[PDB]
């Protein structure tokens, strides 16, 4: 085959509903955590605990 046979090949597609739900959930949780920590650090802040 190597002498004259060519087939294109693609990357492995992840079409799984479980891991797609997990990816979208974890990315949404991480971006909202990053956003809220950035907005609490660059403004006036409160704390449930002393100096937290």
């Amino acid at each position: 085959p190597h002498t004259y046979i060519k087939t294109p090949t693609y990357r492995e597609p992840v079409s799984d509903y479980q891991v797609l739900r997990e990816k979208a959930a974890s990315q949404r949780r991480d971006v909202e955590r990053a956003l809220t920590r950035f907005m609490a650090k660059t403004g006036e802040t409160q704390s449930l605990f002393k100096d937290d």
């Binding site: 955590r33 449930l48 605990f49 937290d52």
Partner: protein, 188 residues
């Protein structure tokens, strides 16, 4: 639903409730209500329904031995510039605190807020909540049964609430709930 799951914590020797000796269940609940309240501060709801639910849940966690029994958060949410649903939820939490912790200064805070608040609906609601969940009844011996409190509430019935006709009936209801139909007993 997160607030309904909270069972009373197993404090040992009245151990101070700090962050390290928190329940492993309640840390997840506390993280979720912190996330919800902070996200309400940036993307608000329709009538701050999540603020009301999170203040109610923080009062649930304080009623059991999980969060320190401190009314300063609810006292900051009960200021004038907030929405009225947040205000009445925070004042309900302060009324529950001054019933459970027998706080004198919180009762004086609530009576001062009855006397001079801009919104009269909030004054009527504070008298209503302090009638429904009274700091003491007539049967109880409490530290808050002075002649000073009897004189304050009699002055609030007599003068002070003379301009509303609904604050005066609420003060009559509060005096009836606290001291009854006869002479206040805790008096010379």
């Amino acid at each position: 639903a997160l607030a309904n799951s909270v069972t009373p914590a197993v404090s040992v020797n009245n151990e101070v409730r700090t962050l390290d000796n928190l329940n492993p269940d309640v840390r997840l609940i506390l993280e979720e209500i912190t996330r919800f309240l902070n996200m309400e501060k940036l993307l608000p709801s329709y009538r701050h329904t999540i603020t009301v639910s999170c203040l109610r849940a923080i009062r649930v966690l304080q009623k059991n031995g999980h969060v320190p029994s401190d009314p300063a958060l609810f006292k900051s949410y009960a200021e004038y510039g907030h929405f009225v649903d947040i205000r009445i939820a925070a004042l309900e939490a302060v009324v529950d605190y001054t019933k459970v912790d027998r706080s004198y200064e919180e009762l004086q805070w609530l009576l001062n807020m009855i006397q001079n608040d801009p919104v009269p609906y909030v004054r009527h609601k504070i008298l209503n909540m302090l009638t429904k969940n009274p700091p003491f009844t007539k049967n109880m011996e409490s530290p808050l049964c002075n002649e000073a409190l009897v004189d304050q509430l009699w002055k609030l019935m007599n003068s002070g609430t003379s301009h509303d006709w609904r604050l005066r009936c609420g003060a009559v209801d509060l005096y009836f709930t606290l001291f009854g139909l006869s002479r206040p007993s805790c008096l010379p």
